[PDB]
Design a binder for this molecule. Sequence first.
Ligand SMILES: [Ca+2]
Ligand SMILES: [Ca+2]
Ligand SMILES: [Ca+2]
Ligand SMILES: [Ca+2]
Ligand SMILES: [Ca+2]
Ligand SMILES: [Ca+2]
Ligand SMILES: [Ca+2]
Ligand SMILES: [Ca+2]
Ligand SMILES: [Zn+2]
Ligand SMILES: [Zn+2]
Ligand SMILES: [Zn+2]
Ligand SMILES: [Zn+2]
Ligand SMILES: [Zn+2]
Ligand SMILES: [Zn+2]
Lengths: 172, 172, 172, 172, 172, 172
Amino acid sequence: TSQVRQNYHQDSEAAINRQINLELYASYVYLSMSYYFDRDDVALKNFAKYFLHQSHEEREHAEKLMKLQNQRGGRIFLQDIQKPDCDDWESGLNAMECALHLDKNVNQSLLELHKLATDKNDPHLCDFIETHYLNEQVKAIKELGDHVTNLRKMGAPESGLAEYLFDKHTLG
Amino acid sequence: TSQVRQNYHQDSEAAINRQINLELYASYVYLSMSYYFDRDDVALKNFAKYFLHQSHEEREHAEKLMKLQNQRGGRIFLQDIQKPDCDDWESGLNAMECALHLDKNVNQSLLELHKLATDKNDPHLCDFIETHYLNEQVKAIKELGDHVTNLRKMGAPESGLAEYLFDKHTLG
Amino acid sequence: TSQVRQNYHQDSEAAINRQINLELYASYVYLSMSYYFDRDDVALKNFAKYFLHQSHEEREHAEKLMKLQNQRGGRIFLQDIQKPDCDDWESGLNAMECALHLDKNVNQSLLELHKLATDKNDPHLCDFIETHYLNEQVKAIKELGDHVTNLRKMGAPESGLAEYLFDKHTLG
Amino acid sequence: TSQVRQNYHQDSEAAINRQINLELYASYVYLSMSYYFDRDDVALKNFAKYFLHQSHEEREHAEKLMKLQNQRGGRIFLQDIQKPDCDDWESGLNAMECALHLDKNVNQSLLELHKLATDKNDPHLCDFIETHYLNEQVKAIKELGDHVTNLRKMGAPESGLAEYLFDKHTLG
Amino acid sequence: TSQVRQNYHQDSEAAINRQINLELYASYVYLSMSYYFDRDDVALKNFAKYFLHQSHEEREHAEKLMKLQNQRGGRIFLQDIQKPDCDDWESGLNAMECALHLDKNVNQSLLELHKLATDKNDPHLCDFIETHYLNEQVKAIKELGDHVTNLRKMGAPESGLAEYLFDKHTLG
Amino acid sequence: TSQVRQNYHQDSEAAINRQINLELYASYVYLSMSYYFDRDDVALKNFAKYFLHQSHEEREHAEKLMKLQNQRGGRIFLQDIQKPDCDDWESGLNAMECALHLDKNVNQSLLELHKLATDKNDPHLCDFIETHYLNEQVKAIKELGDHVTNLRKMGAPESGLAEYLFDKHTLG
Ligand SMILES: [Ca+2]
Ligand SMILES: [Ca+2]
Ligand SMILES: [Ca+2]
Ligand SMILES: [Ca+2]
Ligand SMILES: [Ca+2]
Ligand SMILES: [Ca+2]
Ligand SMILES: [Ca+2]
Ligand SMILES: [Ca+2]
Ligand SMILES: [Zn+2]
Ligand SMILES: [Zn+2]
Ligand SMILES: [Zn+2]
Ligand SMILES: [Zn+2]
Ligand SMILES: [Zn+2]
Ligand SMILES: [Zn+2]
């Protein structure tokens, strides 16, 4: 038991360690999506940049949870980072749809972490999650939804014109 | 035999002289492609600029090989620069496809030059080719492939809209 | 088969994909080592910074190989990133010893990749590896060896004084 | 027939296409002369620079004629660029004598082009040639004559002292 | 056996130690040549400066090889630096001829070192030699050849006028 | 006999030539000591810098004596530079002790040179030696003595802590 540990439940500790793995996984999915758009037969450079940015943010989120763990006197236990579900992400629209899905899954896990912190009366953990994670996640999900909507309305994925112009005018 | 000549095989000398002619030819093809896009009935000003830039780079590559020849104590022997295969390059997509083809043919010749330098144990020539030519060539080929992919996906050559917007948003 | 692919052997492609996984793994090991030094019962802030820097460099190395793959017309296939061997890295000296070991293992893999590229007469891949990877790896290994030597001479891991002063005067 | 074509005779069009080839050839001769002076057994660096500058100007002149062709609604037809008459240009004086000769031959062709434009009552072509080509050509020829005179008076080609000092004091 | 040593053959180690001695010797020859030109009965101040610069570069090359040795885990073994063959270097032309000769001898040794590194499959050593040594050596040899050519053409060593003007206009 | 020679005894000339060799040797010893501290199993970077600085100063001292020789109308005769007595300098303290010893040996030779110049009534040589050499040598010896004292008092060579902290706080 850490000399700093206070009001920090075993279950919260375990849940943070799960959250660290999930942020790392999300980072990995976005890394895979970015370089898919860097292929010579896909060639949408701003989709690639957009997803590489999201990838580095997810890693940064992981790092902040790892800092949180040590702050509270918890002990970090890392797990394998699972390769993503796809190697080939099909189109800019499909990738955005999969990103939206992934962000909601990460959000659900954040919400469950907050429920747990509430159940354990850990107001420091509750506020940490609300301050750094919940509103950022909500903004991301709204942005990914906006992107999906625009791509669909432009006639993606069928219109390669649509994905080309979106890359230029929205992601550029 | 030059007072500077050292470890420089007759065959390498001949092969450099062939490479100088090929870079000059590539310069010429790109020159022809540029001014095709400057015609009043083609009128894609950024395709024209793009290909004029590639043309001057090829000439610069020729000049660097000519410098290399003299550096090593070889003797430059120039040959006719052959007019390109086409006068009319048809479309922005077709021109990019022909540029891709040409760059791979030049790359193949660079690779054969490197094999020869290796077979003759000429590490200075090997590194010259790797330093100035191989990665530049690989980048060019990846870029031309990206361009071809985007044009095709936008609906070129049939969509004159596609070639117009590509000229603006990618080459502009 | 990619429109850009040229002189790029199936085996090189596979070997790059293995190298991408290994750089990612090394990134992960360093991430784990960094936050070990951020524990309240370890508390060596510059060891933590040092290893976090190495972690981000490894990720950057992975990203550059992923770019290389697409450049050459290869296809990126990602694998799980394995959790590191330890959760608790014991001391600054032990962590540096494990870092040295890891960097030599990564170097060995780089060397095998270069042998393969040589055997396949792929001078572009040979030079890529020499330019970005081999000398950087040699510098890292020399630096980690210097660090290990100094820690040992100061009386680490037994002297907590030694690890404290090294963190201040060398890593600070 | 181009939508822009006006008062532009078939013969003028053909003559411009001949002029483009000749400027390109002159560029090539000067390129060859430059790198002759870059040989380790010739080694007059400012003769080399001087002739490389003239080479790039000739190419630029070719490009301006190609622009002219398209401006008027003509169609560019490129021909082989013939290798120059010599590989070895003998001395700085001899090269200047050959440059003088070449510039007068190019001038003669410019004058014949102007006669033709006059005979076809094409005042736009007449003025184009007078504005960009005739006075520039006359200056070049006067300069090359000045250079030849000075080299001869200094005792070139026999005095290697003379060619060395001219390179320093006039071309440097 | 060094904790950093990897893929570094005993023969490479020995060959680096030989190369360090040769760069040091070349430094010494150039030092001797410089101060010959500083004699009151020779008095060519820019020949003296030129050769002193080359001398310090050679020492710097030695130092970089010594760094390389330690980088790879090799052990530096220094040998006597032999006094140069001459005390009196006769003329600016003769000194340049001897410098050319010396640089080719050093180049030959560099090439043999590269053959050895290749035979031992040491791509790090191969690239080190190509990156820092081979092109620098080729440039030096081309420059020394240019200098020899110009001196000879001006009428050195017989013309003391020629050596005086070369010192001013080329080395100044 | 040089047109500039005046009041410059054959013995002084010979003694200067001996002094040039000794400064060069001292330069070499310091060069060897520097790179000993650059080994991965020694790793004291500021000891390495300190001794490399001393090395370049000794070379500069040699060069100034060579200038002196020519100034006075003497003739420089160079001898082999002998490899130093050790390859492995053992510790920072031992290296400083050997440096102190070497500097006193060089000082003794300077003093004998001054006695000779005095005996030959060569006030220009006497003052040259006093101005550039004697006080610089005395400062060096006092500094090396200070360093030795501090290392000994800190518990070097046995305390690797002592050598590490001295490198940081005194040589850094
Ligand atoms: Ca798995
Ligand atoms: Ca709150
Ligand atoms: Ca033909
Ligand atoms: Ca596992
Ligand atoms: Ca290389
Ligand atoms: Ca012909
Ligand atoms: Ca000897
Ligand atoms: Ca000896
Ligand atoms: Zn996140
Ligand atoms: Zn090229
Ligand atoms: Zn790496
Ligand atoms: Zn012209
Ligand atoms: Zn050298
Ligand atoms: Zn001294």
